[PDB]
Amino acid sequence: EVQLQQSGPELVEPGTSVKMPCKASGYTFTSYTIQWVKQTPRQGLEWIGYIYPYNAGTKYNEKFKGKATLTSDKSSSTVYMELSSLTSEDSAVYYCARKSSRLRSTLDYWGQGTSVTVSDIKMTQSPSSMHASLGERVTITCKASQDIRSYLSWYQQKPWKSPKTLIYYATSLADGVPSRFSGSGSGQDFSLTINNLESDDTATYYCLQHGESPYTFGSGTKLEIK
Amino acid sequence: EVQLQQSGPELVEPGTSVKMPCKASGYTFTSYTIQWVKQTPRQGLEWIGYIYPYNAGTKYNEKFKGKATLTSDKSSSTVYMELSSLTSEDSAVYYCARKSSRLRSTLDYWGQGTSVTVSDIKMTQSPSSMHASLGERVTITCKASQDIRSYLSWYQQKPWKSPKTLIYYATSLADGVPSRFSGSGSGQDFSLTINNLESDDTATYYCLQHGESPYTFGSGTKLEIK
Amino acid sequence: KVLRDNIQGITKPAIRRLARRGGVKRISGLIYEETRGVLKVFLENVIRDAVTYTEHAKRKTVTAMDVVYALKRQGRTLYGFG
Amino acid sequence: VLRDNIQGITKPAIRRLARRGGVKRISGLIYEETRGVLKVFLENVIRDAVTYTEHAKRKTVTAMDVVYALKRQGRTLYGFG
Amino acid sequence: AKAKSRSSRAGLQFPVGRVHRLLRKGNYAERVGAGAPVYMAAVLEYLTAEILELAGNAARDNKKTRIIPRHLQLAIRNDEELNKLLGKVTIAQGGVLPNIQAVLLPKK
Amino acid sequence: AKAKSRSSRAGLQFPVGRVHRLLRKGNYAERVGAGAPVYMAAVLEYLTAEILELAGNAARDNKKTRIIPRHLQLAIRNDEELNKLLGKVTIAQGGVLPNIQAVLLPK
Amino acid sequence: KPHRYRPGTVALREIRRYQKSTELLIRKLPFQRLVREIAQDFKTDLRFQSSAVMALQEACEAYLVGLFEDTNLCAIHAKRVTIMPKDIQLARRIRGER
Amino acid sequence: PHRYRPGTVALREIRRYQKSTELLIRKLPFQRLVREIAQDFKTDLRFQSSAVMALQEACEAYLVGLFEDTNLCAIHAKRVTIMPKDIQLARRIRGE
Amino acid sequence: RSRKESYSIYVYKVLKQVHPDTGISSKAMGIMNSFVNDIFERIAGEASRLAHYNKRSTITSREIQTAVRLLLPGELAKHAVSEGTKAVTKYTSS
Amino acid sequence: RSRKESYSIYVYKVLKQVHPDTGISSKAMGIMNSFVNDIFERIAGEASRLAHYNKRSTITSREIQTAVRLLLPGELAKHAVSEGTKAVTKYTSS
DNA sequence: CCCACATGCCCTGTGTCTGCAAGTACAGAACTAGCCAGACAGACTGACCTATTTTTGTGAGGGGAATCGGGAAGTATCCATTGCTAAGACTCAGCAATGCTGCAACTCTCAGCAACCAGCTGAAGATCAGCAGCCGAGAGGCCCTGC
DNA sequence: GCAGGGCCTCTCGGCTGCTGATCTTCAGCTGGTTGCTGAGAGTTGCAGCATTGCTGAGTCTTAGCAATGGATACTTCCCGATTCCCCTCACAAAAATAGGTCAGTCTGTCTGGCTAGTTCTGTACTTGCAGACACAGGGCATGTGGG
């Protein structure tokens, strides 16, 4: 039902500007904020900012102010992000994802991604890479920098696909996620546990905190199966 | 609080038209109809019609259609009555009186009257005139023609003054009327009884039906004290 | 069965008739899509509460009484169906 | 006995109410209309408040009576009980 | 002693006993007074009598010998107090009051 | 045995016992179930926690260490769902949201 | 030359015709299909009473007629006789729906 | 001497009064009006100090909410000056 | 069946008392039933709220009269109060 | 002189658990008490109406959950249902 | 200003048809008559908290004079809606088959009430330091006028 | 578009007050435990009613056209609103004081809920019948396009 359509790859000359849409459908457009995430292989996922279509309110990351500017179009149910003065360190995949105004809620639905190429609290994931069989138990830790009151989420990203939400509020299962995945912990120590594995469970797992104004993702954990 | 101002006497040339105001105050002007009553020594009180300010709806006596025309002005809370083609048989005192849209209610407040001089159910009052002492008991009868289901009122008119309501619904005391007056009866037989008399009880007592569309007053009963 | 795109069954003359009963003399051409959207929003809001009542009563059939309660809790009391 | 205190709602006060309402230019006939609507609202609320205070067999109108009078007209007020 | 209905005792046509049972079984108060059902029946009977009489007058003015939702709606909407009482109430098959704005009529 | 509050049993801060007493003495039904006061206490605590957290964030943005009716009003009015829930509610000394129409602004 | 009524005459005729009757102005089968299509998003394999569908239709048509009355009022305020989506939005936003 | 063009001071006042929370009607006149209105329903009445305050907050909130709709109607009619006809239209659409 | 228990016969009695020759249709009967139920619920809820505000445990004719005053507009309240007082007095007189 | 019985000590505990360092004023305290009372009455009344409609006599967590679903909008209802279900499950285990 | 001919919607008619009004068994709820025990009423009493007062200093409101700028009335174009035709098409109203669901009407246990008890929670009421309001002097923002 | 002279805030800072977060004590409401019973679950089996299909007669939608009217732009004027200054007058804050009200505690009664019995009113079903819907036709207001 909920879909967040985006545009295709954008080849762009350095020094110019690019604007991409985040047309949304299947839900009340004004009741959910639209957050924007950039992903580079150098530094993984990074949070740019969000726009609240209800009152056109925005909030940007400290390091992304000026570079990015967010606008909303309530008539067409579309949200744009504009990047100005495109530097060489701007070639990445930009994801727009939906998030409710509730402090407990997280990024539940994402866009397929827009590949743009130009011609605080640190969250530490202890296992950088892991290997396991088809019926084993694995566990990922997301040791935090400061105290976040259970405001942590877990995402699963298949290769060249948008992330999928598994856990929110550090313990609650997402919509449609099987009971195999189970999160735990509060404060500064968090954990993700996958009960019995499959060939499908091969992906990279991220942990995101939204307890304070700049949202920070985890380093990532590439999981190998057999 | 509730007061219905009118104009003074108006000497008028025959064959012309006259408009008199009924400016109202002290109540919600739109929630009550304004009824118009003409009084001649020849035929006593007669009913012309009413206007409902809430929806500008009117209803006229069949003998008064065309002769009279009623309009309302919600801005100044004023009701006007127009008499067209003024014939010599138009010299009378015209009263405007308030009446709620409730079928039980009757003409509670009246205007002072405007003296205009040009240069069915028959309701029978048994005693045409009566005499009594300072402390006796008297009874007036208002035998009706057809069946009116308790929709009958009693009025007291001092000479050269507007009528004052005493009884409505054939039994209910009016507002401020002492308990000496007591009405009774239903169907076709009605009675008004004043328990103990006073020197200020000398007046003419009328009875009005409003069970059917043309309202008809009683012939009148002149009461003399000592 | 699966229904698809039934908001267009509220035809242009039907909206015209509703406007005429509403006392409207001249109707713009963009009024019809706006009216369809408004009607869809209203119907969704009412039917959500009706279905909530129906599933609380542990039934599979939506009843006129459930519709009446759903309307009543939105300040839109309806006389004639219960 | 108090007479004609609706004129105590001065023109600057109505201007301030409009400014808080986001109104930039105010016509000269707005003030009488505002006084009328304020009087209608106040009568409607005070009638219910007095009805409550006289059902309670009291002769002092209380903030709780005012709150109930507002609440039964769809104007719920937080902060007075 | 022969049974006398409370409706007959109070001179009403609405059921004082049924109204009392509905007041008791509706979770309104811990206990219900004796005269409260009588007062409730009287008020309800007066209201339905007024509405029905106005609707019957409308039906007679329409040259009809039977009250329908159109006559009920006409009676309710042509009276300011009944309109205020039933402002947020929809009457099925009642229609609307005939009303056209003045500026929509032809000038001459 | 030693007394254990139902709030402690359910891990709540709101009084399950008081909520049960208010449901029983409020003339809502003939009987009240065991888990109904727990459910109501949980829902009420969640709602007040959400409102208080938003109000505290607004107060921190305003560089204040206390929550006032202005902060409560800002928190409620800046949220779509909270505004829908409290649309017909007046907050004393809460003011209004700063909003000027575009056409009123000078060129 | 064939007879032709000037624009507005038939409009007032239809206003008088439809402000006097009580029938439902939307077709029953299209409205029922719309209702079932909307309900599919809440629970699958639902069933509706015919009286439930009729109650929904009466409520929806009353709501639309009242909204069109308010829209006409706003359009007349704007010194027009043509109702516009801006008038619809103004009426809905003053009513408290937007 | 310095003079601001018509509109600048008005916008400054809009920004000033949309930021504060104090009551905008004088307490003594509002209280006098409240007692005068109450005289029509019950003689020799009595008011708590907080009942009048609650009435004042309710009235001011109602007036601000009505002025917002009045401004919306004025803008719809392609003006910037609010008029009694906009007030009446706002009340009529609200259902008062 | 389960004894749907409407107000139809009472409404018909009132109709035959006010308009002896006028009938009624089934749809108008249902609308009148809905009206009676709605008004009963409104007044009963208001009376219960009054009792709870005043820390009473019983609903009395005073509660019903105050609820009638609060809910009915203008002369409707006056006439309904008169009818209720008359009926209560007659019932008390047995 | 008689146990006004507000929600102040509970709301202060919630405040100290969500924002440990900021306080609250008396006016905001009263506003929060009013909010809690209002929401309590709304949910309880809706649950009572549900029980009456379904011909029951007891208010259960199912009634409370349905009332919460009907009265709260969007994600508010979902998170409140989650919190209530979690609390009930924790309480059942004692 | 006054005529059309042409059409609309209103009134009048008998033939028909569905829906309302009336008669019966029949069962369930209401009335009666005790009896019981509690919620509320009548007459105390302390005692807040409302109201009518006097005084003071100052902040707001009111009445004016002038000028800008917005709203109102008038014009002239154009684009967008109504009115109409005939062609497709989707709705309706009637029939009849099936599987589904919403009940009714009996069992029983398990949950909730009730009513007693002690003891721990939460209220009223003192006391106090820290945050928020104030004053005042200082920075940069934007407005207005001139160029 | 660009520069310079008021005057108007957000921003500091340092005080001073009063309001919040705290500790103390008690009085009353909650929990623990027992034992009881009545409500709601669980499972049968019935009758109803929602579904889906099929037909085919008719009314209602749609599309395309052509040509009137109304909406929206523009300009000009003039009217009614803003700003500002001054002055005066009402508000607010204060300390007070009295008489009126509200509320609290006891006590005695009358009125409500609870019960078990009996009958009579209300419902449900089934009936004939006539208010009102049909279609079919005279006869009148006003229609739009003449003259």
Contact H31, H49 (CB under 8 A): no
Judged by C1' against the alpha carbon of G28, the nearest nucleotide is K91
B34 is written with which tokens? 């304004």
Selected residue of F47, F72, F88, F97 to mutate for chain D interface (largest D Cβ count, 10 A)? F88
Contact C21, G19 (CB under 8 A): yes
Name every chain D residue with its beta carbon within 8 A of the beta carbon of F100: 22
Bridge partners for E32 per DSSP: I59
Name every chain D residue with its beta carbon within 8 A of the beta carbon of H70: 21, 23
Structural domain harbouring I65: 23-92
Q: Is the CB of J27 under 7 A from strand K?
A: no
Residue J76 lies in a domain: yes
CATH number at residue I35: 1.10.20.10
Task: Give the dihedral of Cα atoms A61, A62, A68, A72; nearest 10 deg.
Answer: 50
Position A148: which residue type? I
- Which positions ≥6 away from A225 have C-beta within 8 Å? A131, A132, A133, A134, A197, A198, A199, A201, A202
I92 is written with which tokens? 């008390």
SS3 A143: strand
Of A105, A149, A172, the CB nearest to J75: A105
Separation between Cα atoms, residue H26 and residue B32, nearest integer Å: 36
Residue E46 lies in a domain: yes
Separation between Cα atoms, residue I85 and residue E38, nearest integer Å: 9
Q: Is the CB of F5 under 7 A from strand K?
A: yes
- The DSSP H or E segment spanning D2 is none
B in contact with E (at least 3 C-beta pairs within 8 A): yes
How many angstroms from the chain centroid is the CA of residue C21? 17
Expressed in Å, this structure's resolution amounts to 2.8
Bridge partners for F66 per DSSP: J23
Separation in Å, CA of H53 to nearest CA in chain F:
10
* Chain K nucleotides covered by protein, CB below 7 Å: 6-9, 19-21, 28-33, 39-40, 49-51, 60-62, 68-72, 80-85, 90-92, 100-104, 111-113, 119-125, 130-132, 143-145
F44 is written with which tokens? 């009420």
Residues 10-69 of H with CB under 7 A from strand K: 26, 46-49
B188 is written with which tokens? 């076709």
Separation between Cα atoms, residue A50 and residue A56, nearest integer Å: 10
Separation between Cα atoms, residue A193 and residue A176, nearest integer Å: 17
Q: Is the CB of E13 under 7 A from strand K?
A: no
Residues 25-44 of F with CB under 7 A from strand L: 30-31
One DSSP character per residue, A74-138 reads: TTTTEEEEEE-S--GGG-EEEEEEEEESSTT----EE---EEEEE-----EES-SEEEE-SS--E
Closest to B217 (Cα-Cα) out of B171, B161, B153: B153
Contact C68, C56 (CB under 8 A): no
Going by DSSP bridges, is the β-strand pair G82-83/C26-27 parallel, antiparallel, or unpaired? parallel
Q: Is the CB of G48 under 7 A from strand L?
A: yes
Contact B219, B142 (CB under 8 A): no
Bridge partners for F71 per DSSP: none
Residue G66 CB neighbour total at 10 angstroms: 16
How many residues can be counted in chain D?
Answer: 81
Separation between Cα atoms, residue C58 and residue H95, nearest integer Å: 38
Contact A79, A22 (CB under 8 A): yes
> How many interchain CB pairs under 8 A, E with G?
34
Separation between Cα atoms, residue H56 and residue H27, nearest integer Å: 8
Name every chain I residue with its beta carbon within 8 A of the beta carbon of B104: 79
CATH number at residue F61: 1.10.20.10
- The DSSP H or E segment spanning B222 is strand B222-225
Judged by C1' against the alpha carbon of D12, the nearest nucleotide is K61
C12 is written with which tokens? 């242009």
Contact I85, B173 (CB under 8 A): no
Q: What distances in angstroms separate CA A111 from CA A8, A81, A115, I91, one per listed residue?
A: 11, 13, 12, 74
Q: Is the CB of G96 under 7 A from strand K?
A: no
H82 is written with which tokens? 């609010």
Separation between Cα atoms, residue J65 and residue J80, nearest integer Å: 9
Position D64: which residue type? M
Separation between Cα atoms, residue C55 and residue A123, nearest integer Å: 43
- How many distinct structural domains can be found in chain E? 1
Bridge partners for B114 per DSSP: B94
Interface contact G53, partner H, CB < 8 A? no
SS3 B93: strand
Interaxial angle between packed helices J8-18 and J26-53, expressed in degrees from 0 to 180 and rounded to the nearest 10: 110
E69 is written with which tokens? 């939702």
- The DSSP H or E segment spanning I31 is helix I26-53
Whether residues G52 and C67 touch (CB distance < 8 A) is answered with yes
How many residues can be counted in chain J?
Answer: 94
Order of strands, sheet of B18-21, starting from the edge strand that comes earlier in the sequence: B18-21, B78-83, B68-73
The burial class, CB within 10 Å (0-12 / 13-18 / 19+), for G85 is middle
Scanning F1-107, the segments in alpha helix (DSSP H) are 6-10, 16-25, 36-61, 69-77, 80-85
Query: Which residue on chain F is closest to J51 by alpha carbon?
Result: F29
Closest to E22 (Cα-Cα) out of A195, I36, H72, J91: I36
**G97 CA vs L5 C1’ separation (Å):** 50
A141 is written with which tokens? 């830790």
Separation between Cα atoms, residue A105 and residue F56, nearest integer Å: 18
I in contact with H (at least 3 C-beta pairs within 8 A): no
Contact A195, A207 (CB under 8 A): no
- How many distinct structural domains can be found in chain J? 1
Contact A17, A86 (CB under 8 A): yes
Contact B153, B167 (CB under 8 A): yes
Closest to A24 (Cα-Cα) out of A83, A72, A92, A82: A72
Contact G18, C20 (CB under 8 A): yes
Question: Domains, chain D, ranges and CATH?
Answer: 1-81 (1.10.20.10)
Separation between Cα atoms, residue B62 and residue A13, nearest integer Å: 91
Separation between Cα atoms, residue A118 and residue A17, nearest integer Å: 10
Nearest residue, CA→C1' of L28:
J3
- Which positions ≥6 away from J83 have C-beta within 8 Å? F42, F43, F45, F46
**H21 CA vs K55 C1’ separation (Å):** 31
Interface contact J54, partner C, CB < 8 A? yes
SS3 B4: strand
**I10 CA vs K25 C1’ separation (Å):** 21
Separation in Å, CA of E99 to nearest CA in chain I:
24
Selected residue of E14, E31, E43, E67 to mutate for chain I interface (largest I Cβ count, 10 A)? E43
Q: What distances in angstroms separate CA A201 from CA A156, A192, B19, F74, one per listed residue?
A: 9, 13, 93, 44
Contact A190, A170 (CB under 8 A): yes
Task: Give the dihedral of Cα atoms D41, D43, D47, D48; nearest 10 deg.
Answer: 10
- Which positions ≥6 away from F86 have C-beta within 8 Å? F76, J35
CATH 3.40.50.720 fits B3-118, yes or no: no
Order of strands, sheet of A68-73, starting from the edge strand that comes earlier in the sequence: A18-21, A78-83, A68-73
| Distant-in-sequence contacts of I47-56, Cβ < 8 A, 24+ apart | I47/E28, I47/E29, I47/E36, I48/E28, I48/E29, I48/F27, I49/D68, I50/D52, I50/D55, I51/E28, I51/E29, I52/F26, I52/F27, I53/D52, I53/D56, I53/D64, I53/D68, I54/D55, I54/D56, I56/E29
**C17 CA vs L140 C1’ separation (Å):** 28
Question: Domains, chain G, ranges and CATH?
Answer: 15-98 (1.10.20.10)
Separation between Cα atoms, residue I67 and residue I81, nearest integer Å: 10
G10 is written with which tokens? 């038939």
Residue J32 sits at φ, ψ, to 5 deg, of: -70, -40
Listed in order, strand segments (DSSP E) in chain I are 23-24, 58-59
SS3 I5: coil
Q: Is the CB of G27 under 7 A from strand L?
A: yes
Query: Which residue on chain F is closest to J58 by alpha carbon?
Result: F31
Separation between Cα atoms, residue I72 and residue I52, nearest integer Å: 21
- Which positions ≥6 away from E51 have C-beta within 8 Å? E72, E75, E76, E82, I32, I35
